[PDB]
Design a protein around this ligand. Structure first.
Ligand code: GLU
Lengths: 182, 359
């Protein structure tokens, strides 16, 4: 999965998350055509009966969250990221840090994230204080012995006052932000 | 050299790969718009970050149109073939096929939508032809590019599944994974791109390519047919909107679980006003953790493709429901049995599915 974003002189804005599911998807390549095929259908529930059960021609539940934030009807921020179910958490965290804590965009993107979808599934990035992890586990949380990177947020901010753009690529991958001048 | 933060007066591009960022920026510099650039970028990423996305998959592309001021989503999520069945991932005993194994099966291949979504995008907002936009990636595939540490790692890490398909001729040259520094050449992929450049998406959803892909999925156990590819069409979704701190958020609706739960977690957290706590305080993390536990439980019980199931979107975001959930959160204790709540109490209707625990 990968997320990228683009904004142009005319006001158009794009926030696009795209994927083949696992890395290299199924691993299957169309012989003679070089196209690696997705394993997207495993995003369906393996045991049927629920909202996300497999059905012919149905689409598997995704966690991709390309998002655009607006202030007075003008787009001012785009956010998105790869990461399976953790996507929701990475996007939530970047928004929280940039909006509620008021952090500068890059710093908000780089702020150590956490993720936990149940009592048995916890992840945290390097930088979450060790004393904090010990206090949280002390209460019943189950953070592990080691950090893992979470997500990879590419984001663009748009300052309609100065008519400028700001791009950020998460250091979790070797991405690049490139401004356009003329 | 490449930067992870940049500024610009006339536009901006941010992607996970420098070569793709360069290609998209080139498009803007030469007068194209954000959608043209985005399509260019997708083909470039398909070639240079091959393990992450491509015409073999699908995505959600959100576009704010600076002319009409409307925001829409080109939903290119893959569809299960007509021959797929509810228990196709279960063994003969009714137990789920181990995940790592499930991932490599033909039954796991969704009908690709990415190419169709790029086509749709250019059709609606394009100012450059798919011919102009795909060409730079035909060159990267045909003449190659040097692979970094990351791609080299992915290749070695996934050598086993790659070594089982035709994919090994590209990534496992002789029997060895390409290393950092080596040139990755994707001649067949360049051929496919050239076919798309002259023929259009029909090159993918019909004809010979369609038959080989369909045949290959069958060879690996799946039921995909040529008609499944012929039937595929993307979907145009309306964003789900939410008010937040004076801003309006346009995010992804089902078939994604992302937009609903990003909004639900923000509304839940509002009651606790995180910024009254230091950004690395245990309090802030404690609250994010307990909130994630509730929202991911709701996701697991109520999220699915809306063409098939009733997702209680109005209920999951209803203020009194959000209040019920905020009620379950305590700064000083952990809820050890977090569970989905009942959003149906706050909207009309009922689920047309059950609650089934997953392994
Ligand atoms: N298949 C997942 C994404 C996988 C990933 O981001 O690693 C989804 O659509 O949410």
């Amino acid at each position: 999965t990968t997320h990228f974003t683009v904004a142009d002189r005319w006001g158009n804005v794009v926030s696009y998350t795209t994927t083949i599911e696992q890395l290299f998807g199924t691993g299957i390549m169309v012989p003679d055509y070089g196209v690696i095929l997705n394993n997207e259908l495993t995003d369906f529930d393996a045991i049927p009966g629920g909202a996300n059960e497999v059905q012919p021609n149905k689409r598997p539940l995704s966690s991709m969250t390309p998002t655009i934030l607006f202030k007075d009807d003008k787009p001012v921020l785009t956010v998105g990221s790869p990461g399976g179910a953790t996507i929701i958490s990475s996007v939530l965290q970047t928004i929280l840090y940039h909006i509620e804590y008021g952090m500068e965009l890059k710093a908000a993107v780089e702020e150590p994230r956490i993720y936990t979808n149940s009592m048995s599934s916890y992840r945290y990035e390097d930088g979450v204080p060790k004393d904090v992890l010990s206090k949280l586990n002390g209460m019943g949380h189950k953070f592990g012995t080691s950090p893992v990177d979470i997500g990879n947020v590419q984001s663009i901010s748009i300052d309609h006052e100065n008519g400028t753009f700001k791009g950020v690529a998460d250091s979790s991958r070797n991405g690049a932000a490139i401004g356009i001048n003329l | 050299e490449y930067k992870q933060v940049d500024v610009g007066k006339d536009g901006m591009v941010a992607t996970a790969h420098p070569l793709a960022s360069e290609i998209g920026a080139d498009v803007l510099k030469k007068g194209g718009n954000a959608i043209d650039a985005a399509v260019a970028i997708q083909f470039a990423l398909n070639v240079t970050e091959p393990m992450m996305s491509g015409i073999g998959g699908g995505g959600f592309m959100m576009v704010y149109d600076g002319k009409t001021k409307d925001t829409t989503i080109i939903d290119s999520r893959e569809r299960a073939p007509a021959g797929a069945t509810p228990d196709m991932f279960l063994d003969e005993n009714g137990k789920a096929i181990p995940f790592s194994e499930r991932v490599t099966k033909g039954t796991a291949v969704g009908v690709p939508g990415t190419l169709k979504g790029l086509e749709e995008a250019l059709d609606k907002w394009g100012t450059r032809s798919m011919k102009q936009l795909i060409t730079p990636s035909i060159k990267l595939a045909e003449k190659g590019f040097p692979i970094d540490s990351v791609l080299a790692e992915a290749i070695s890490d996934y050598q086993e599944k790659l070594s089982r398909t035709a994919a090994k001729d590209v990534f496992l040259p002789n029997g060895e994974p390409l290393k950092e520094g080596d040139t990755l050449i994707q001649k067949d992929l360049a051929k496919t791109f050239k076919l798309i450049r002259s023929k259009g998406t029909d090159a993918f959803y019909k004809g010979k390519f369609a038959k080989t892909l369909s045949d290959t999925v069958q060879d690996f156990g799946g039921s995909m047919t040529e008609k499944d590819l012929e039937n595929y069409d993307i979907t145009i979704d309306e964003p789900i909107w939410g008010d937040y701190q004076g801003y309006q958020i346009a995010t992804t609706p089902p078939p994604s679980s992302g937009g609903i739960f990003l909004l639900q977690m923000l509304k839940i957290l509002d009651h606790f006003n995180l910024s009254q706590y230091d950004v690395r305080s245990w309090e802030k993390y404690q609250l994010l953790a307990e909130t994630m536990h509730l929202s991911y439980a709701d996701r697991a019980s109520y999220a699915g493709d809306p063409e098939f199931v009733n997702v209680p979107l109005k209920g999951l975001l209803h203020p009194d429901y959000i209040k019920e959930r905020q009620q379950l959160i305590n700064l000083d204790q952990v809820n050890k049995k977090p569970k989905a709540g009942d959003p149906w109490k706050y909207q009309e209707g009922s689920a047309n599915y059950k609650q089934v625990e997953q392994p």
